[PDB]
Design a protein around this ligand. Sequence first.
Ligand code: ZN
Ligand code: ZN
Ligand code: ZN
Ligand code: ZN
Lengths: 149, 151, 151
Amino acid sequence: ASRLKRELHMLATEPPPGITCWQDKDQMDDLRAQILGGANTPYEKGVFKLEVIIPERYPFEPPQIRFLTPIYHPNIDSAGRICLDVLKLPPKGAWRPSLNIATVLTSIQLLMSEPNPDDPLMADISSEFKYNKPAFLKNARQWTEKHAR
Amino acid sequence: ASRLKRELHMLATEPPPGITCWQDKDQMDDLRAQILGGANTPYEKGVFKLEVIIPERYPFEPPQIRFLTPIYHPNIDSAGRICLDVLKLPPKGAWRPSLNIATVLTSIQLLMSEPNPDDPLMADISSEFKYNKPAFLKNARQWTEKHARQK
Amino acid sequence: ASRLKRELHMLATEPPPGITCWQDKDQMDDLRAQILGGANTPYEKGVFKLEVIIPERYPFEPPQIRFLTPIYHPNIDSAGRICLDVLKLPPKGAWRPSLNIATVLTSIQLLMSEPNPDDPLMADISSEFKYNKPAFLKNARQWTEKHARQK
Ligand SMILES: [Zn+2]
Ligand SMILES: [Zn+2]
Ligand SMILES: [Zn+2]
Ligand SMILES: [Zn+2]
């Protein structure tokens, strides 16, 4: 502990240029959610599990949400990370303390139904969505059958 | 502060249509495993670390297992998630309470020796496995050398 | 609970061949870091968050570090995992106890400025970096604006 304790104090106080390092404490790390796949989307009949972390400064900062169930989507990556305006920090992002967990989950449900070509987290899936939509839908349906449904 | 408790009550009793939100309590979250790379597989020289999480209603739901070590394989992704029948619920999947941690780890070891081309979690890797096999095997050997600890 | 303890006993005493289990005892898991995007790189004006885990055997094994903020780079994957010599053990790697958390964070910052096409975790990005650099720089800039920029 002597090294680590002192090491951490040196990083807190005299870090290298462009670098900072601190401790956080989440309010809650064991919250989970489930979203049903929507009618008239390739995720229909699938059930999708998610992780919801409530960070230290909620509701001033947004919940931190990743998909646990795999999903084939241009805005959702191999690690389940999600690109969405209401999940991004103010002032540039759309999160505010006048929204809540329910509204962000409803926004993720909407995203599943309305993928956004301008916000790629998965460049290959985004390219397929743009230039060969029938192939994208086939793949999205198969992944839903394999990993969700 | 008190908001969150109230918020969760409201999510629990009256959620949005198609959405549910609840609290999980894992039986154990710090359990680890290690699988030695198999003979006559491209993973031979490596050792592979995994995390094993035991959920609240085990053994009625399967263990939640992810590779911590990077591995180049069509059925395993960058988060270490694993597409395998014994890790999925019936009727589609093969989990039942007559299986256990030891048997599912053995099943994952067999999956490492026998990849499945129809169960993809990484699109480029699956395609390459089926259509450009020599490139797959070269990449799998190189990833073992560069990103796994050597045996 | 009784079932789980019985299983852990059996795994400790008579595991399947090639497979072992144990419980990790990390020194620390709640440490966070931040790297400012470097001047004269495509990551300029981005702010990048990272997770730092300090394992049981630090400083004789390296710290375990990944990006939480998405970044477009040949040596960093979709889960934020980082391919870098000082994060790996010898003989293949360069971690030694004379290094520390601060120097490794500085090495990650240097890696951002100087990608390494020998060690690709992202094959498509590595090819773009080698053969179509203006397109690499343009895409790295766009990803920075979309996922890492705060004003
Ligand atoms: Zn984003
Ligand atoms: Zn690709
Ligand atoms: Zn699957
Ligand atoms: Zn590596």
